[PDB]
């Protein structure tokens, strides 16, 4: 009984969080009403990691939905599995955040955060042993970014010895709602450097290029991008939601992946990624070749531009675990220059016999590369291009912020980039 508390904030956070619970709810045999209807006991072995058990053998996701406007969450409550979420766990306001970090962090968010923490505290008090929390959210908006990182700052205050993980969607000019996204991302990234143990960096540009080039989608939508995230999110949490020789919680997984407290921003990856030749069998060497291919990376960073501090792969399905070992050792041996030699055996692998829906076998990738610094450089440049003219700052100063807070967040991120750079040499 090692429970995880899930929190999804903002439009992006809640739309992705919804699909995530839809994806794993199917994997665990839970139906839209919360009633189990599977065929294996492995589906219920670790079902309490993400689901609470109510009367009548009902399973209610341990999830807390948060937003400053009701729009997105109303949809969730009307979506496929909308009924599966605890009603009292929908916490929302009416003002909105206007894609403004300051509104989410200082003003509108502040007015609503205490009420969210009351639900969080209510979900924790019922945990036999809380592993930690996980937050899904974008960094380019106002609620998920501004209030999300505010929630993290308060959850750490009340639970300082619990693991905090986040799935963070990074903004890209190619998939942009507003021009202030670099502002909101730079401000949030500093919060995440301080108050999270692991951050799954999901670059919306990478999610777009994959939908366009690889998946051959002429015009990608936010739903198409979220399908990738739903599949990847289900991939990394596989070892957490199913049994195996793993025996790994959030703290033990963080220990093996985070050599330094601030360098905990991971590149995700999924395989296969096929367009509609979709019935072909995928061989273990193929899974491994693709899973390490930059084209399958979702952080829009070329790993060959840096070095892996650590790596973790999670294979799913009935496959040759001997052939898996052989292929994992093949990638490291044929490219050992791209793995730091001052951390021996920094590539770990886990297996799960239960594959995703409609996939004989799959592989989920978790890379802690120093090449992630390229991601923070994009945001930093876009940030500076506007802040040098103080463009669009009036939205933020109007909520009480000072240019100094910007100059500091700018420095903190440029520090973070220099820290990755020193370990790349």
């Amino acid at each position: 009984m090692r429970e995880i508390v899930h929190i999804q904030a903002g439009q992006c956070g809640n739309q992705i969080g919804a699909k995530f619970w839809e994806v794993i709810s199917d994997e665990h045999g839970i139906d839209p009403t919360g009633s189990y209807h599977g065929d294996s006991d492995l589906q219920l072995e670790r079902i309490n990691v993400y689901y609470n058990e109510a009367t009548g053998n009902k399973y209610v996701p341990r999830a807390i939905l948060v937003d400053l406007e009701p729009g997105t969450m109303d949809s969730v409550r009307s979506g496929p599995f909308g009924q599966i979420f605890r009603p009292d766990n929908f916490v929302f306001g009416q003002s909105g955040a206007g894609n403004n970090w300051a509104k989410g962090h200082y003003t509108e968010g502040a007015e609503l955060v205490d009420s969210v923490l009351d639900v969080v505290r209510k979900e924790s008090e019922s945990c036999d042993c809380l592993q930690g929390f996980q937050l899904t959210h974008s960094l380019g908006g106002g609620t998920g970014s501004g209030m999300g990182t505010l929630l993290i700052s308060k959850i750490r205050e009340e639970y300082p010895d619990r693991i905090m993980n986040t799935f963070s969607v990074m903004p890209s000019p190619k998939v942009s709602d507003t021009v202030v996204e670099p502002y909101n991302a730079t401000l949030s990234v500093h919060q995440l450097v301080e108050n999270t143990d692991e951050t799954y960096c999901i670059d919306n540009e990478a999610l777009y290029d994959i939908c366009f080039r690889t998946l051959k989608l002429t015009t990608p939508t936010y739903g198409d991008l979220n399908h990738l995230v739903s599949a990847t999110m289900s991939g990394v949490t596989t070892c957490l939601r199913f049994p195996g020789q793993l025996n790994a919680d959030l703290r033990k997984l963080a220990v093996n992946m985070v050599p330094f407290p601030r360098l905990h921003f991971f590149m995700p990856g999924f395989a296969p990624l096929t367009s509609r030749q979709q019935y072909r069998a995928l061989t273990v060497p193929e899974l491994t070749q693709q899973m390490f291919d930059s084209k399958n990376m979702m952080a829009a960073c070329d790993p060959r531009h840096g070095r892996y501090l650590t790596v973790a792969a999670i294979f799913r399905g009935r496959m040759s675990m001997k052939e898996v070992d052989e292929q994992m050792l093949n990638v490291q041996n044929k490219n050992s220059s791209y793995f730091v030699e001052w951390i021996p055996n920094n590539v770990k692998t886990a297996v799960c016999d239960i594959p995703p829906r409609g996939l004989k076998m799959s592989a989920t990738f978790i890379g802690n590369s120093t090449a992630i610094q390229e991601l923070f450089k994009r945001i930093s440049e876009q940030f500076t291009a506007m802040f040098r003219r103080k463009a669009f700052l009036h939205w933020y100063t109007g909520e009480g912020m000072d240019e100094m807070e910007f100059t500091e967040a700018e420095s903190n991120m440029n520090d973070l980039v220099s820290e990755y750079q020193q370990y790349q040499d």
Partner: protein, 438 residues
């Protein structure tokens, strides 16, 4: 008769303890319910098997064991397994959340909050003892509990039982089965704080057991069950003398006397033969000379190294099955004229031999084939220091960048204990060189 208390710390120690007591029960003819028909003295007795088992008025034979894990999922298998009736609840101690492969977490943070409960449950077994010899501590090096909590337990056992002996069965880290990158840190941290508290330690390299399983047993990807049934064979061969009538290694003090002339160098190498797959059509039963010769092949050692380039300080031959001294000497003489067996000038060039006529018992359905004779050699070679060098080297690579150090400090450990423990290993590696090289 004098009792021996077994302590299994962590996932590695508990699962290995489970495999051993399963085997102990098959050998001594004890059923999963604790009943032993051959035992004629009901609810009492001071037989050789009573050093590992106590008795109840109801004829139940209860292991003198204690399982300790900082998370309950592994010990819960014992509570509901085939041999769930052997142990009573007091014997199985479990926490809520483990040490996350963090030595400082198992030794300090979580260790401090449970050590007293452990020593209490251990004191309950000690009170059932008329003359306690000491403890057998099964634990891993890389695990956060295995390394961290064990060293604290060892420090306290040397306090509450200053006169008792303590032997270790320690699982060396192997990347082919480990999922922890910081195991070099933990291993060295626990050797440092445990060295002076352990009188004899048998290191089992998971790498060795892995190849012995793939080579001799034809297991493509061996699991923990495969690795453990094999390790409980070697453990049985080592503890057989304490559980059966004999005169070699009859109490825990004898292991130190016969195997460790210098206290710090108390890590004997173990070599076992033969390991024969049960799926074989039918194997040509090996002779005394054949299995005794294999005791000097690196591919049968629990720690891969090359004794040819070290110096022996002692050497035991534990035979089981159809073996007589005449055949032993014949093979020994033949091996001295074909093998490089250099002893230290301040120690005799000899072999203490022990023979038990009961051949190795094999778990029904397991992977090992029943053989007519088997041997396990306990030699104290300077060549095992190769394992420290490997480990020490990896420690130096990460610690040069202070990689992962922040996890330990955050649990209350000081960064200096790292270099303090790493200097001790530097001294340990030097002694081995002082005694082995010219």
């Amino acid at each position: 008769m004098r009792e021996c208390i077994s302590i299994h710390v962590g996932q590695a120690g508990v699962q290995i303890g489970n495999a051993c007591w399963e085997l102990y029960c098959l050998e001594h003819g004890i059923q999963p319910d604790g009943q032993m028909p051959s035992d004629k003295t009901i609810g009492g007795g001071d037989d050789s098997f009573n050093t590992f088992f106590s008795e109840t008025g109801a004829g139940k034979h209860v292991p003198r064991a204690v399982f300790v894990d900082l998370e309950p999922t592994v010990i819960d298998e014992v509570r509901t397994g085939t041999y769930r009736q052997l142990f009573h609840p007091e014997q199985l101690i479990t926490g809520k959340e483990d040490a996350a492969n963090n030595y400082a977490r198992g030794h300090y943070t979580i260790g401090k909050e449970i050590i007293d409960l452990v020593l209490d449950r251990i004191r309950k077994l000690a009170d059932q003892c008329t003359g306690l010899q000491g403890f057998l501590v099964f634990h891993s090096f890389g695990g956060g509990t295995g390394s961290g909590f064990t060293s604290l337990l060892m420090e306290r056992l040397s306090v509450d039982y200053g006169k008792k002996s303590k032997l270790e069965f320690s699982i060396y880290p192997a990347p082919q089965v480990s999922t922890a990158v910081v195991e070099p840190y933990n291993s060295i941290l626990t050797t440092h704080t445990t060295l002076e508290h352990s009188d004899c330690a048998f290191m089992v390299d998971n790498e060795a057991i892995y190849d012995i399983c793939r080579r001799n047993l034809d297991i493509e990807r061996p699991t923990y069950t495969n690795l453990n049934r094999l390790i409980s064979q070697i453990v049985s061969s080592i503890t057989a003398s304490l559980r059966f009538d004999g005169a070699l290694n009859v109490d825990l003090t004898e292991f130190q006397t016969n195997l460790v002339p210098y206290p710090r160098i108390h890590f004997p190498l173990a070599t076992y033969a033969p390991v024969i797959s049960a799926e074989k059509a039918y194997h040509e039963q090996l002779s005394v000379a054949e299995i005794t010769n294999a005791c000097f092949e690196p591919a049968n050692q629990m720690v891969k190294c090359d004794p040819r380039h070290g110096k022996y300080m002692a050497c035991c031959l534990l035979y089981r099955g159809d073996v007589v001294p005449k055949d032993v000497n014949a093979a020994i003489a033949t091996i001295k004229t074909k093998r490089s067996i250099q002893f230290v000038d301040w120690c005799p060039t000899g072999f203490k031999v022990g023979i038990n006529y009961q051949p190795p018992t094999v778990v029904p359905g397991g992977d090992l084939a029943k053989v007519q004779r088997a041997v396990c050699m306990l030699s104290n070679t300077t060549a095992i220091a190769e394992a420290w060098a490997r480990l020490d080297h990896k420690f130096d690579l990460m610690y040069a960048k202070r990689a992962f150090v922040h996890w330990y400090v955050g649990e209350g450990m000081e960064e200096g204990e790292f270099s303090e423990a790493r200097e001790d290993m530097a001294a340990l590696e030097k002694d081995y060189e002082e005694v082995g090289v010219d």
